[PDB]
Amino acid sequence: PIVQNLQGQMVHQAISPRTLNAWVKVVEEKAFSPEVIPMFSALSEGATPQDLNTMLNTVGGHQAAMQMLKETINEEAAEWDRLHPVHAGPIEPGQMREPRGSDIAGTTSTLQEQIGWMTHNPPIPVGEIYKRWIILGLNKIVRMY
């Protein structure tokens, strides 16, 4: 999700000023009416868990909603762990570990690990998965608005 580095290579760049500016304008105008969801969805396209947490933490006010969001995420992270049984660790030493709920929510994973899952073949789309949990939470919250 892309910027050119010094080596001439196209690599991931974190959620941009332009993207965040639009997100804050959407929050100011729409949080958390139903119209907020399509806008969140398009603005978070390509986002890592780290970018998603920036988005969640740039919401001013709405303390009740953001607390429901946090409850939703914690429950989905717990159910993800339950429904995706893993071995203790990778069988082959250097191989990429499978992400847990807390990796998807970005509390126990680094940006490099996130990008690693996202660009795996086949992808392990931890951004899309976290977004789904966030949209689950939004769909509960829109009832307040």
Residues found near Cl ion in the complex (CB under 5 A): 118, 125, 127-128
Distance (Å, rounded) from C-alpha 72 to C-alpha 88? Answer: 26
Q: Shortest distance, CB of residue 99 to Cl ion, whole angstroms?
A: 11
Count other C-beta atoms under 10 Å from residue 44's C-beta: 21
Distance (Å, rounded) from C-alpha 145 to C-alpha 135? Answer: 15
**Which one of residues 19, 72, 109, 114 is an interface residue with a copy of itself (CB under 8 A)?**
19
Q: Shortest distance, CB of residue 85 to a copy of itself, whole angstroms?
A: 25
Does 110 sit near a copy of itself (CB under 8 A)? Answer: no
Residues sharing a CB contact under 8 Å with residue 41, sequence separation 6 or more, in sequence order: 131, 135
Q: Shortest distance, CB of residue 124 to Cl ion, whole angstroms?
A: 8
By a kind-dependent CB cut-off of 5 to 8 A, residue 127 interacts, out of a copy of itself, Cl ion, none, with: Cl ion
Give the type of residue at 45: E
Give the closest residue to 126 by CA, choosing from 113, 137, 135. Answer: 113
Which two tokens mark 29? 């105008």
Of 39-47, 51-59, 63-71, 75-83: span binding a copy of itself (CB under 8 A): 39-47
Q: Which residue has the tokens 């660790």?
A: 89
Binding site for a copy of itself (CB under 8 A): 1-4, 6, 8, 10, 16, 18-19, 21-23, 25, 35, 38-39, 41-43, 45-46, 119, 121-123
